[PDB]
Design a protein around this nucleic acid. Structure first.
Lengths: 204, 147, 49, 62, 95, 211
RNA sequence: GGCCUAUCGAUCCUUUAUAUUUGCAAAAUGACGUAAAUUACUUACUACUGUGCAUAUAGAGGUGUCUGAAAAGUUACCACAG
RNA sequence: AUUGGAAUUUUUCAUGUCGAGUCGUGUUCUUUGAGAUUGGAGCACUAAUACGUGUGAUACAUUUCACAUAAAGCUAAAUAUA
RNA sequence: GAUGUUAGGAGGGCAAAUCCGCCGAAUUUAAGCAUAUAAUUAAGCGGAAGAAAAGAAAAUAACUAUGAUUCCUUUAGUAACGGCGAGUGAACAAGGACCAGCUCAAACGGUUAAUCCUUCGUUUGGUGCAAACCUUUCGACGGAAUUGUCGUUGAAUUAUUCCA
């Protein structure tokens, strides 16, 4: 019952109450360090739906990331190259800022911990503030659980760098299916490699 | 292969069949189709007349199977019978061959050529030409529209 | 330097292959051809054995 | 075969010689037989000509 | 175009109702939540602006409202739907 | 010269020698497939690893007469044929949830095919005869004499897959029982010409029903 | 068309003419038009049917380095192929 | 020898559910086969509840019809192996 | 939220052919060159496995329809994109290899959570020479957790049959 009410309240995002809650949270986030543990999830509803469980091996972490385009990594501004390809400003990176936030925890603090999922929380002009759901496979409860246990598999260390977060499926375009998907479905690399490939073979 | 090739004909002859004055160069006209309009225009005009510029609408997502139709002309329909069947109809004017052209994969029946006149035949098909229908009716046969 | 592919799969038709077998068996039938091939064959009673 | 019969129509002597291959017809009844020497016969054409009461004749026989 | 649901196909290959021969073999709870959520949250600033335009109630204001909604909300069906919903709420509110 | 072709159609400029793969593994792969299939076939007690995929119609106007193996079991239709979902799952038969065929002739044909498979199959007692056939919840628990005799007897008769249809050796009709009055060419054109008008009427029909 | 020999310009592109000819992809936009019928999801019969876009055909806008690159200088600091 | 469970099957009664700064739109850049923008990403505005809204490769409005159920997740096999 | 050489544990690094992520050019081609091309490639920084990745419908069709993924054969050098120049370029059906399904969350269950876990323990089996592994229910003492663990897939009610 309670989560359904919280969902519908949170969906609107405008109102005195929502605007208050956003401002108060934004204030508190602006003070806090880059990456930190929180006691309970900031939005419990959003956490439930993105697979948080109250189970001991499930931990929640709040993350700070700067907004906007990243600017091309070129010394003394403009560099050599064709007029078509200069791209110093307006370069707009392939991976999402959400994935960047998962990546910061993923590289710095994960190890023991493994990234499970992440949600938006709130933002201003300079920063987006994200909460990342993480899980330890070392701890006994998750190893015991006949659910969730796949997260214990060796292949799942560094999911955010594996493209195997929710965000990772998103920016890799795997949410898109059908004819719109085009040269992407087995892997973008794989499909391009098949088309680039010529097979030398018995007959045509 | 190597036994019979051009090197074995020219092996000791210095300019290799490619001209003592000319001296065979890496890409002496540039790549592929490049000289079209510019300096190979005469070749393109005399051998490839329809090539340059646009024509018609764009369909953007055509799909071949919507318009896929194999055709057969009426002339060859009696030939779809085996020999003994053709003899049996030739003998007997009491019964007509029914022909389902779909089993032979055809869908439109076209009107070309002669027929051995005064002998009925039933043709079952999706599509028929104007002339084909008229000739089948003319020879005492029947046309059956069927999907 | 040699690339791996140098036409490993050639065709030659089903009908052509079949013809070669039938004609070779027919040739094997022929007494003169057996001797001509270099088989010693004088004291064999006759060639279709 | 249609062309062969069409050509032979004014000939009551039946011995056709063809320096090429004789191919069958699937476009008409093709009843009337001939005596034909050819370089090569399609199997279907040969069978029809033999059935009809014709002769499929070798170049050595010719 | 227009495949049949009521009169069987007639064996005609033109792509009409027809085709090859065949016989086909074929609240309260959310509303309470919505009312409670509205009591807690009120209305969005654009919703309020639309309410003022719809309250003015002219052909000019209603055109303006639809354009404003279409410009902000993008999706035209959605904008008409939102405008309709607000109009109904103003009708309900008056009672 | 060069009157053979306007273009080279070759396009290997995306560094083909880097990309390239040379393939001549065919027969050796087939042997591996055979070995794998032999190992499986033997291992399962000799009990057939094949599974019935029932008969379904091939898409669009090009292949609509054609019919092939689909994923033709659906539990409600199958239960209508007589068989439980659990039994079908137990023999590993070719269910799919979302296929759901829409025509009576296809269903009626496929329920007969399902019934044939159901009667034909016979099952060894799971724990060596500690339970029965029951009422059909899983059919056809065997006896020991029959199961031994059946296992020794491999199939004599033809395969369990696709099947042939109407003759090339054409059917006939009497010459006085034909029509000579139809015009198909006119009918097709008139039908196509009047189609737009009918579609408009059908649109209004849909609206009238919906109100 | 100009007494004759001289008075001028492809494709792509743009633009306007023209059609009882077309398309915009599962469907429809003249029009329930015309008849009948009405216990209705009725049934026939109609040569000429939305905005916008796309065509096809016909001209015209231009290529004077005139069978049609969107193009300035400089090197006695120089390099290289001839 | 207890306990427990499942599947069907009757007969009643219940018509509940369905992932939001996400979809979407505008915009930019990137990207593609995507074309009056195909996917991605940045930014601005920001939804609807199943009779919804996502699709049906030309911008659009008004309406069909067919097909699907996004925005959470897992999964053997055939395949690749300088 | 700190603090702890607290108790139990983990991550780090190396190697890289195939695999996956970012970031990311030019020579080159157009007989020049600026768009296009080379190329979503090379280099760069990261992450995995014996294969991975993808995967159970916000799919395709317009048929008498099909029905998770991969792969092969194919469509197809086609629709299409492009100083429409050079050049570039897919999808659906079909034949096969091969085929396997699913569960969280929300919904539903309050007779007092039917859950979970650490530490301490304890015994009915079985191998092995021995090390050792392998089964095995029963109690404590701690905690976690209703800011939600577990069960369940509308609900009862009948008869049958199965399974532990």
């Amino acid at each position: 019952g309670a989560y359904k009410y919280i969902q519908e309240i949170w969906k609107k995002k405008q109102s005195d109450a929502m605007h208050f809650l956003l401002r108060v949270r934004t204030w508190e986030y602006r003070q806090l360090p880059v990456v930190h543990r929180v006691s309970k999830p900031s939005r419990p509803d959003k956490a439930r739906r993105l697979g948080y469980k109250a189970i001991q091996g499930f931990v929640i972490y709040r993350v700070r990331v700067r907004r906007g385009d990243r600017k091309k990594r070129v010394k003394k501004g403009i560099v050599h190259g064709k007029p078509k390809h200069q791209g110093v400003h307006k370069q707009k990176s392939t991976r999402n800022l959400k994935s960047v936030a998962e990546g910061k925890v993923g590289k710095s603090i994960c190890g023991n911990l493994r990234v499970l999922n992440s949600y938006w929380v709130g933002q201003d002009a300079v920063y987006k503030y994200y909460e990342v759901i993480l899980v330890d496979p070392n701890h006994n409860a998750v190893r015991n659980n006949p659910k969730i246990n796949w997260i214990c598999n060796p292949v799942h260390k560094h999911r955010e760098l594996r493209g195997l977060t929710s965000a990772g499926k998103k920016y890799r375009g795997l949410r898109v299916k059908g004819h719109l998907s085009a040269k992407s479905r087995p892997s973008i690399r794989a499909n391009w490699k098949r088309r680039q490939l010529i097979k030398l073979r018995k007959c045509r | 292969a190597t036994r019979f090739k051009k090197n074995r004909k020219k092996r000791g002859h210095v300019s290799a069949g490619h001209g003592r004055v000319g001296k065979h160069r890496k890409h002496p006209g540039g790549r592929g189709k490049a000289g079209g309009l510019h300096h190979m225009r005469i070749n393109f005009d005399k051998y490839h007349p329809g090539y340059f510029g646009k024509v018609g609408m764009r369909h953007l997502n055509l799909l071949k199977n919507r318009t896929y139709c194999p055709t057969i002309n009426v002339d060859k329909l009696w030939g779809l019978l085996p020999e003994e069947k053709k003899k049996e109809f030739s003998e007997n004017k009491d019964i007509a061959p029914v022909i389902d052209v779909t089993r032979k994969g055809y869908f439109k029946v076209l009107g070309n050529g002669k027929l051995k006149h005064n002998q009925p035949i039933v043709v079952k098909a999706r599509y028929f030409s104007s002339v084909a229908e008229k000739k089948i009716k003319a020879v005492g046969g029947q046309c059956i529209l069927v999907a | 330097p040699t690339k791996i592919w140098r036409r490993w799969g050639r065709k030659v038709n089903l009908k052509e292959k079949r013809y070669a077998v039938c004609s070779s068996i027919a040739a094997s039938g022929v007494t003169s051809l057996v001797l001509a091939r270099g088989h010693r064959i004088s004291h064999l009673k006759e060639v279709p054995l | 075969l249609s062309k062969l019969q069409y050509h032979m129509a004014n000939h009551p002597n039946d011995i056709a010689v063809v320096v090429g291959s004789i191919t069958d017809d699937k476009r008409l009844f093709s009843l009337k037989q001939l005596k034909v020497c050819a370089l090569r016969f399609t199997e279907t054409a040969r069978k029809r000509i033999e059935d009809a009461g014709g002769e499929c004749l070798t170049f050595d026989q010719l | 175009g227009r495949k049949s649901t009521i009169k069987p196909a007639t064996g005609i290959a033109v792509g009409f109702n027809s085709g090859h021969v065949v016989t086909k073999r074929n609240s309260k709870r959310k509303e309470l939540i919505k009312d409670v959520v509205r009591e807690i949250t009120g209305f969005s600033p654009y919703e309020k602006r639309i309410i003022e335009l719809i309250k003015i109630g002219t052909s000019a204001s209603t055109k303006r409202s639809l354009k404003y909604a279409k410009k902000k909300l993008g999706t035209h069906k959605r904008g008409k739907a939102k405008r309709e919903e607000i109009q109904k709420v103003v009708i309900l509110q008056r009672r | 010269v060069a009157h053979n072709n306007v273009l080279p159609n070759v396009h290997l400029h995306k560094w083909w020698q880097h990309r390239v793969r040379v393939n001549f593994s065919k027969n050796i792969k087939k042997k591996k497939r055979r070995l794998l299939r032999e190992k499986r076939r033997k291992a399962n007690g000799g009990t057939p690893i094949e599974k019935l995929h029932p008969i379904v119609h091939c898409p669009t106007q090009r292949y609509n007469f054609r019919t092939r193996l689909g994923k033709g079991f659906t539990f409600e239709e199958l239960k209508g044929a007589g068989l439980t979902p659990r039994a079908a799952q137990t023999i590993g038969i070719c269910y799919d949830k979302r296929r759901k065929n829409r025509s009576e002739e296809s269903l009626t044909k496929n329920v007969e095919r399902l019934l044939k498979y159901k009667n034909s199959l016979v099952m060894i007692p799971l724990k060596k005869n500690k339970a029965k056939k029951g009422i059909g919840g899983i059919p056809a628990d065997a006896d020991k004499n029959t199961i031994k005799e059946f296992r020794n007897k491999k199939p004599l008769l033809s395969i369990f897959k696709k099947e042939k249809n109407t003759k090339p050796f054409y059917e006939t009709i009497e010459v006085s029982k034909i029509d000579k009055e139809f015009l198909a060419y006119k009918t097709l054109r008139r039908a196509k010409l009047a189609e737009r008008r009918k579609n408009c009427r059908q649109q209004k029909k849909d609206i009238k029903f919906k109100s």
